[PDB]
Design a protein around this ligand. Structure first.
Ligand SMILES: CCCCC/C=C\C/C=C\CCCCCCCC(=O)O
Lengths: 49, 48
C-alpha cells in the first residue's frame, strides 16, 4: 500500500499514512523494490530488524 | 605514501541502486544475503 501505490501525491500535498500493529519485515521488498536512496538518521539500518 | 599488508580485491556485479549497500553498516538484500562488509573495515570500495 506504500511502495506499490498506483498513484503518488504531489510534494506540496505530500500524503501522510499511519502505520500501526504490523511487522516491518522489509525483506519482502527485496524481490521487486529497488531503491536508489535509503538513508536512516536516528537508527542504524542493521538494527532495524 | 603507504604500503599495504594483505591486499584482497573482491569483485562482483550488482544493480545501480545496490551500490550504496556496499558499506560496513548497511542493510538490504545484497548487504544481508550476498556480500557484507565488516564494521571495522579498512579499505576502499570502487564501483563503476
Ligand atoms: C510499510 C512501512 C513500515 C515502516 C516500519 C518502520 C520502520 C521499519 C524500517 C525500514 C523499512 C523500509 C526499508 C526499505 C529499504 C530496504 C533495504 C534496501 O533495499 O536497501
Amino acid at each position: 500500500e506504500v511502495f506499490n501505490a498506483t498513484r503518488f501525491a504531489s510534494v506540496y500535498a505530500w500524503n501522510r499514512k499511519r502505520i500501526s500493529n504490523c511487522v516491518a519485515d522489509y525483506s519482502v521488498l527485496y524481490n521487486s523494490a529497488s531503491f536508489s536512496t535509503f538513508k536512516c538518521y536516528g537508527v542504524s539500518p542493521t538494527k532495524l530488524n | 605514501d603507504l604500503c599495504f599488508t594483505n591486499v584482497y580485491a573482491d569483485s562482483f556485479v550488482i544493480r545501480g541502486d545496490e551500490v550504496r549497500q556496499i558499506a560496513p553498516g548497511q542493510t538490504g538484500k545484497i548487504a544481508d544475503y550476498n556480500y557484507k562488509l565488516p564494521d571495522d573495515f579498512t579499505g576502499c570500495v570502487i564501483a563503476w
